[PDB]
Scaffold this active site. Structure first.
Site, mmCIF file in Angstrom:
data_model
loop_
_atom_site.group_PDB
_atom_site.id
_atom_site.type_symbol
_atom_site.label_atom_id
_atom_site.label_comp_id
_atom_site.label_asym_id
_atom_site.label_seq_id
_atom_site.Cartn_x
_atom_site.Cartn_y
_atom_site.Cartn_z
ATOM 1 N N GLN A 105 0.851 -1.216 0.000
ATOM 2 C CA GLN A 105 0.000 0.000 0.000
ATOM 3 C C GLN A 105 0.882 1.261 0.000
ATOM 4 O O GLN A 105 0.488 2.242 -0.666
ATOM 5 C CB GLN A 105 -0.952 -0.030 1.191
ATOM 6 N N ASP A 108 2.258 1.262 -3.732
ATOM 7 C CA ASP A 108 1.040 1.609 -4.518
ATOM 8 C C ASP A 108 0.779 3.112 -4.464
ATOM 9 O O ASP A 108 0.643 3.716 -5.534
ATOM 10 C CB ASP A 108 -0.220 0.995 -3.942
ATOM 11 N N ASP A 110 2.593 5.653 -3.636
ATOM 12 C CA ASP A 110 3.710 6.393 -4.289
ATOM 13 C C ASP A 110 3.436 6.482 -5.795
ATOM 14 O O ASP A 110 3.785 7.504 -6.345
ATOM 15 C CB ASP A 110 5.072 5.736 -4.002
ATOM 16 N N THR A 184 2.970 11.212 -8.907
ATOM 17 C CA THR A 184 4.011 10.992 -9.942
ATOM 18 C C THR A 184 4.091 9.492 -10.211
ATOM 19 O O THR A 184 4.094 8.719 -9.249
ATOM 20 C CB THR A 184 5.388 11.520 -9.533
ATOM 21 N N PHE A 186 6.675 7.911 -10.943
ATOM 22 C CA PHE A 186 8.017 7.475 -10.435
ATOM 23 C C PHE A 186 8.033 7.085 -8.941
ATOM 24 O O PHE A 186 7.473 7.837 -8.089
ATOM 25 C CB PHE A 186 9.056 8.586 -10.591
ATOM 26 N N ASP A 188 9.531 7.621 -5.969
ATOM 27 C CA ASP A 188 10.210 8.915 -5.670
ATOM 28 C C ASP A 188 9.644 9.539 -4.386
ATOM 29 O O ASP A 188 9.694 10.802 -4.244
ATOM 30 C CB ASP A 188 9.976 9.900 -6.813
ATOM 31 N N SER A 190 6.936 10.338 -3.485
ATOM 32 C CA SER A 190 5.921 11.387 -3.738
ATOM 33 C C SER A 190 4.852 11.322 -2.639
ATOM 34 O O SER A 190 4.234 12.347 -2.341
ATOM 35 C CB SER A 190 5.336 11.268 -5.121
ATOM 36 N N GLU A 258 -6.028 6.647 5.902
ATOM 37 C CA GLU A 258 -7.061 5.624 5.550
ATOM 38 C C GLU A 258 -7.165 4.513 6.609
ATOM 39 O O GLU A 258 -8.294 4.026 6.815
ATOM 40 C CB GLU A 258 -6.757 4.935 4.222
ATOM 41 N N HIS A 351 -5.572 -5.980 -1.336
ATOM 42 C CA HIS A 351 -6.869 -6.023 -0.612
ATOM 43 C C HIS A 351 -7.125 -7.426 -0.034
ATOM 44 O O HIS A 351 -7.820 -7.507 0.998
ATOM 45 C CB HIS A 351 -7.976 -5.477 -1.533
HETATM 46 C C1 HEM Z 1 -8.719 0.317 3.663
HETATM 47 C C2 HEM Z 1 -7.670 -0.215 2.651
HETATM 48 C C3 HEM Z 1 -6.561 -1.020 2.850
HETATM 49 C C4 HEM Z 1 -6.123 -1.618 4.111
HETATM 50 C C5 HEM Z 1 -6.785 -1.603 5.267
HETATM 51 C C6 HEM Z 1 -5.885 -1.096 1.535
HETATM 52 C C7 HEM Z 1 -4.698 -1.815 1.305
HETATM 53 C C8 HEM Z 1 -4.041 -1.913 0.073
HETATM 54 C C9 HEM Z 1 -2.847 -2.635 -0.211
HETATM 55 C C10 HEM Z 1 -2.036 -3.464 0.748
HETATM 56 C C11 HEM Z 1 -2.533 -2.431 -1.543
HETATM 57 C C12 HEM Z 1 -1.421 -2.998 -2.345
HETATM 58 C C13 HEM Z 1 -0.593 -3.980 -1.960
HETATM 59 C C14 HEM Z 1 -3.576 -1.618 -2.062
HETATM 60 C C15 HEM Z 1 -3.608 -1.186 -3.343
HETATM 61 C C16 HEM Z 1 -4.551 -0.272 -3.805
HETATM 62 N N1 HEM Z 1 -5.625 0.208 -3.168
HETATM 63 FE FE1 HEM Z 1 -6.185 -0.173 -1.432
HETATM 64 N N2 HEM Z 1 -6.612 -0.413 0.636
HETATM 65 C C17 HEM Z 1 -7.679 0.093 1.248
HETATM 66 C C18 HEM Z 1 -8.687 0.894 0.692
HETATM 67 C C19 HEM Z 1 -8.661 1.369 -0.586
HETATM 68 C C20 HEM Z 1 -9.621 2.248 -1.126
HETATM 69 C C21 HEM Z 1 -10.857 2.758 -0.430
HETATM 70 C C22 HEM Z 1 -9.235 2.537 -2.382
HETATM 71 C C23 HEM Z 1 -9.997 3.381 -3.345
HETATM 72 C C24 HEM Z 1 -10.971 2.355 -3.904
HETATM 73 C C25 HEM Z 1 -11.694 2.885 -5.099
HETATM 74 O O1 HEM Z 1 -11.478 2.375 -6.226
HETATM 75 O O2 HEM Z 1 -12.505 3.820 -4.948
HETATM 76 C C26 HEM Z 1 -8.045 1.829 -2.616
HETATM 77 C C27 HEM Z 1 -7.372 1.846 -3.788
HETATM 78 C C28 HEM Z 1 -6.228 1.083 -3.986
HETATM 79 C C29 HEM Z 1 -5.508 1.183 -5.248
HETATM 80 C C30 HEM Z 1 -5.847 2.063 -6.417
HETATM 81 C C31 HEM Z 1 -5.311 3.434 -6.051
HETATM 82 C C32 HEM Z 1 -5.615 4.388 -7.171
HETATM 83 O O3 HEM Z 1 -4.890 4.397 -8.190
HETATM 84 O O4 HEM Z 1 -6.597 5.141 -7.079
HETATM 85 C C33 HEM Z 1 -4.407 0.369 -5.135
HETATM 86 C C34 HEM Z 1 -3.259 0.142 -6.147
HETATM 87 N N3 HEM Z 1 -7.700 1.110 -1.506
HETATM 88 N N4 HEM Z 1 -4.465 -1.308 -1.077
HETATM 89 CA CA CA Z 2 5.527 8.596 -7.189
#
Ligand code: HEM
Ligand code: CA
Ligand code: NAG
Ligand code: NAG
Ligand code: NAG
Ligand code: CA
Length: 595
Positions: A105, A108, A110, A184, A186, A188, A190, A258, A351
């Site tokens: 997370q 992700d 970043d 970003t 990258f 980095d 961010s 979050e 998730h």
């Molecule tokens: C609450 C949430 C978490 C933990 C208690 C949790 C955890 C992760 C991990 C460990 C990820 C990668 C290994 C990961 C990736 C991405 N998440 Fe997620 N996450 C929780 C809650 C959310 C919520 C709410 C969102 C937004 C959902 C939506 O689509 O409206 C969410 C997104 C993402 C996501 C996309 C981010 C983006 O580009 O907008 C991951 C790559 N997570 N989470």
């Molecule tokens: Ca970044």
């Protein structure tokens, strides 16, 4: 093929042809095309958007419009019938710490972020959606199936606003609709320093000259700093405990608060930044503020890169790591550094790695206090459980000595996320991460599972028995088919996450490919990558690949017992060692003897 370069909502401002540190915004990393990587750009398309009207309407918007001759099943039905389970017993991962889940997370956050369309919070937009469950424009509500317990208890839907899209945000009507990445592309840091210049210097200690990030002045963690508190009222971190009135943390990333452990991971990183920036005024007292910020920002960047590529990805990707991320052969400035639309769904395998509870552990790694274990859902936007109930050392000890959830084709997402998610404005612990991830594949016009199997050079099943063979699972296959009627309609998120895991990884072949290609790209296309010769001096580099997450804990907490390998499932007394047994970040090669 068409649209050549729609580049509207951005101030263009060009580049600084040397600036020995990155932009906050990701601009100017690529010199041929400067926007590549930058935040507030469209997510790259690895394959063309798939929409109902081929422009912007998501599949399952118009009841009497099929996808390949079949209706798409309601997100929540999929969530209920496939993604749900009851028994948290036997669900944990005997060979991955909770840190494994948390770093996911971190990395992700970043890389990618597709914020909702605002288009006015002084409108019914919020009411017309939540209150009346009316579908319209950017209100794309998650309808409940019949027999759904939430029918009885919440209403007819749970709210969902479509994600931000480029050129405008005011509805666009000519070519395929493309969501924005507001961080970003990258690796980095961010998520520590911001992706917009405004926020970036708001996060900074300008008052003094030392080059620090703004730390909390309300509250402290023994001697140790907390993130500064977040301005904006309304605050959800306030809302969950009205009495404690502890608002959200202000980090480079807006999802920082979050859940308690992510705000926790954020608090290790700020501390490290400041720790870097004192050591540098210590060794290079002539160097000004800017030079101490940026030169620390630069190290933390490389730290995130090493841990990820050296410690994290090898245990996500496993067998497929070398196939996709062979050794570093230097910056290829023809590599697309951008995050792809599909990758932001691929990376949510995370998730299924989130367990139902978080513990706080004392100095002998035993229940810290009588309420040491908590249900996940109490800890969404929960900042008070940190400043008013033990700091971060007891949460970091949990992260070290508790285990991540193993994805299980039968126990996919804990009801802590699947029934009990809190969303920053909706006042009920009552949302479904899984159904959201499925509504969102459609919102983002994602190609079906078979398209993406196709893309990774893998079989495209058309039949129940065809699908049984790939998922290696009869009843999982039967259900998918009963809902999706063809494997071509299965949403990339759930499709991808139903495949058994590759040897020595925690994702399947389909995900390994999508993830592999992206981390390959985000390394190879980065001009400021740490190993890119010239970026760092060879001695600096010889110091940097001795860094450890163990080490990050030791210098940035009052924790003295840490494992060598913080991602593998590590038990107290045994697998833990003293901090002195652990290689430190020797910054001697940073010494500037300009005098
Ligand atoms: C609450 C949430 C978490 C933990 C208690 C949790 C955890 C992760 C991990 C460990 C990820 C990668 C290994 C990961 C990736 C991405 N998440 Fe997620 N996450 C929780 C809650 C959310 C919520 C709410 C969102 C937004 C959902 C939506 O689509 O409206 C969410 C997104 C993402 C996501 C996309 C981010 C983006 O580009 O907008 C991951 C790559 N997570 N989470
Ligand atoms: Ca970044
Ligand atoms: C800036 O640093 C000075 C010196 O430590 C300190 O007094 C001040 O609190 C810092 N400002 C913030 C908000 O971190
Ligand atoms: C709210 O915080 C107060 C202290 O600030 C605490 O004693 C109380 O139990 C908390 N309530 C909840 C519901 O967490
Ligand atoms: C650089 O990447 C481009 C586009 O991916 C590719 O065509 C080229 O072969 C690569 N060059 C090297 C030296 O890796
Ligand atoms: Ca894509």
């Amino acid at each position: 093929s068409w649209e050549v370069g729609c580049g509207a909502p951005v101030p263009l401002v060009k580049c600084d042809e040397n600036s020995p540190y990155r932009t906050i915004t990701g601009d100017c990393n690529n010199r041929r095309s400067p926007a590549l990587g930058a935040a507030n750009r469209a997510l790259a398309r690895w394959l063309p958007a798939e929409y109902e009207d081929g422009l912007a309407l998501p599949f399952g918007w118009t009841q009497r419009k099929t996808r390949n001759g079949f209706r798409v099943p309601l997100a929540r039905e999929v969530s209920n019938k496939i993604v749900g389970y009851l028994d948290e017993e036997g669900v944990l991962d005997q060979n991955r710490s909770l840190l494994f889940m948390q770093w996911g997370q971190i990395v992700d956050h970043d890389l990618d972020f597709a914020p909702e369309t605002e288009l006015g919070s002084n409108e019914h937009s919020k009411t017309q959606c939540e209150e009346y469950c009316i579908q319209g424009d950017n209100c794309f509500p998650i309808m409940f199936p019949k027999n759904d317990p939430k029918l009885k208890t919440q209403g007819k839907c749970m709210p969902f606003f479509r994600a931000g899209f480029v050129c405008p945000t005011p509805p666009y009507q000519s070519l395929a609709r493309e969501q924005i990445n507001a961080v970003t592309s990258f690796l980095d840091a961010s998520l520590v320093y911001g992706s917009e210049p405004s926020l970036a210097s708001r996060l900074r200690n300008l008052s003094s000259p030392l080059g620090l990030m703004a730390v909390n002045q309300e509250a402290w963690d023994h001697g140790l700093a907390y993130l500064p508190f977040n301005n904006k009222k309304p605050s959800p971190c306030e809302f969950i405990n009205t009495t404690a009135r502890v608002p959200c943390f202000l980090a480079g990333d807006f999802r920082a608060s979050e859940q308690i452990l992510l705000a926790t991971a954020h608090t290790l990183l700020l501390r490290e930044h400041n720790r870097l920036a004192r050591e540098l005024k210590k060794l290079n007292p002539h160097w000004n503020g800017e030079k101490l910020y940026q030169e620390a920002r630069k190290i933390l960047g490389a730290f995130i890169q090493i841990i990820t590529f050296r410690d994290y990805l090898p245990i996500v990707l496993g067998s497929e790591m070398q196939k996709w991320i062979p050794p570093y052969q230097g910056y290829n400035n023809s590599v697309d550094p951008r995050i792809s639309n599909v990758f932001t769904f691929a990376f949510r395998f995370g998730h299924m790695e989130v367990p139902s509870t978080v513990s706080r552990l004392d100095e002998n790694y035993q229940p810290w206090g009588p309420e040491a274990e908590l249900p996940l859902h109490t800890l969404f936007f929960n900042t008070w459980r940190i400043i008013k109930d033990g700091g971060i050392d007891p949460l970091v000890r949990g992260l070290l000595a508790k285990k991540s959830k193993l994805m299980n084709q039968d126990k996919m997402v804990t009801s802590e996320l699947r029934n009990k998610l809190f969303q920053p404005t909706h006042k009920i612990h009552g949302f479904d991460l899984a159904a959201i991830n499925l509504q969102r594949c459609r919102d983002h016009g994602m190609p079906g599972y078979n398209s993406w199997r196709g893309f990774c050079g893998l079989s495209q099943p058309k039949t129940l028995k065809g699908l049984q063979t790939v998922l290696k699972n009869k009843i999982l296959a039967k259900k998918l088919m009963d809902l999706y009627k063809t494997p071509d309609n299965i949403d990339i998120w759930i499709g991808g996450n139903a495949e058994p895991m590759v040897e020595r990884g925690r994702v399947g072949p389909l995900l390994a490919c999508l993830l592999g290609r992206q981390f390959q790209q985000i390394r190879d296309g980065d001009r400021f990558w740490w190993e890119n010769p010239g970026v760092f001096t060879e001695k600096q580099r010889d110091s940097l690949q001795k860094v450890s997450f163990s080490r990050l804990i030791c210098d940035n907490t009052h924790i003295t017992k840490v494992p060598l390998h913080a991602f593998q499932a590590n038990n107290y007394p045994h697998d833990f060692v003293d901090c002195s047994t652990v290689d430190k970040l020797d910054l001697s090669p940073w010494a500037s003897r300009e005098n």
